[PDB]
């Protein structure tokens, strides 16, 4: 129809961090529509994409992507720790990521 979304919307929140020092290797993701750690256990291992545009055309496309995956649950509110192949660039704090349904056990 007019909807083709085969993924779940998500926001890149921040890095894993203490009060004063962060860890860029691990990102924190809010999955749109989960509010409980036991709901976040559904999305463990799912492939995350961050999609972004560039002026320069790379390989027939002006669109690039960074791939990560959900690694574990964070906190008490459905925030998930995610590790990307290359860490997200920290300007994407508040940017949208696509959380996919594969790999699937459901």
């Amino acid at each position: 129809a007019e909807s083709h979304r085969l993924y779940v919307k998500g926001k890149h929140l921040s890095y894993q961090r203490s009060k004063r020092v962060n860890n860029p290797n691990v990102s924190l993701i809010k999955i749109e529509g989960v509010a409980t750690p036991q709901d976040a256990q559904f999305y463990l291992g799912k492939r995350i994409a961050y999609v972004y545009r560039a002026s320069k055309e790379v390989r027939g496309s002006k669109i690039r992507v960074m791939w990560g995956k959900v690694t574990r649950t964070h906190g008490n509110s459905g925030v998930v720790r995610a590790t990307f192949r290359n860490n997200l660039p920290a300007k994407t704090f508040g940017a949208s990521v696509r959380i996919f349904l594969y790999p699937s056990n459901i």
């Binding site: 926001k11 929140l13 809010k30 749109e32 704090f93 508040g94 940017a95 949208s96």
Partner: protein, 197 residues
């Protein structure tokens, strides 16, 4: 889950609405606050007026033009409570605060748009009954906001235009809900009743 979320400031507690809005902007949600003059603060009016006077007296001694600015409007009092909950000196905090619009009254285009409330910031849900509270309209005027009566004349003007919008919407909701009610006890209706819809 909306591209722009519009909160009606009326009935809310200023700090708890500022905590929610700060975290909402920092997560990338665009937020518009309207009717900031009906915001509320816990504590009696005179007590909160004293707290603003303590805030008014602190300024740079050698040059008042460069010191702490003391904004009068209730929209900027609320904005003053958002800063201090946002790292506004960083470019991320600057990009967050760009996702915020605060208004007195309800201006266009937000007059004909859906407004929401934040139940963790609502005073009627939060405050213990019998505890006193301050309204941001009276406080701001008492410290020099000049536009309480202007907003009131335009707010009552909008309510007249909006009450008669809801008048014809009640008539149309009546007509739609009648044909749907007749559509019950039919073949298609009873199948959707088994499927829950």
């Amino acid at each position: 889950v909306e591209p722009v979320v519009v909160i009606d400031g009326k009935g809310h507690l200023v700090g708890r609405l500022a905590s929610v809005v700060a975290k909402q902007l920092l997560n990338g949600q665009k937020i518009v606050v309207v009717r900031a003059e009906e915001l509320n603060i816990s504590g009696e009016f005179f007590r909160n007026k004293l707290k603003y006077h303590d805030f008014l007296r602190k300024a740079t001694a050698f040059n008042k033009t460069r010191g702490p600015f003391h904004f009068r409007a209730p929209s900027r009092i609320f904005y003053k409570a958002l800063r201090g909950m946002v790292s506004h000196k960083t470019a991320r905090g600057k990009a967050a605060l760009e996702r915020l619009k605060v208004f007195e009254g309800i201006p266009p285009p937000y007059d004909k748009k859906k407004r929401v409330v934040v139940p963790q910031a609502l005073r009627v849900l939060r405050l213990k009954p019998g505890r006193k509270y301050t309204t941001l309209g009276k406080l701001s005027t008492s410290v020099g906001w000049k536009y309480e009566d202007v907003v009131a004349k335009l707010e009552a003007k909008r309510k007249v235009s909006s009450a008669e919008y809801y008048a014809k919407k009640r008539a149309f909701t009546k007509k739609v809900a009648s044909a749907n009610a007749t559509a019950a006890e039919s073949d298609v209706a009873k199948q959707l009743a088994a499927l829950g819809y």
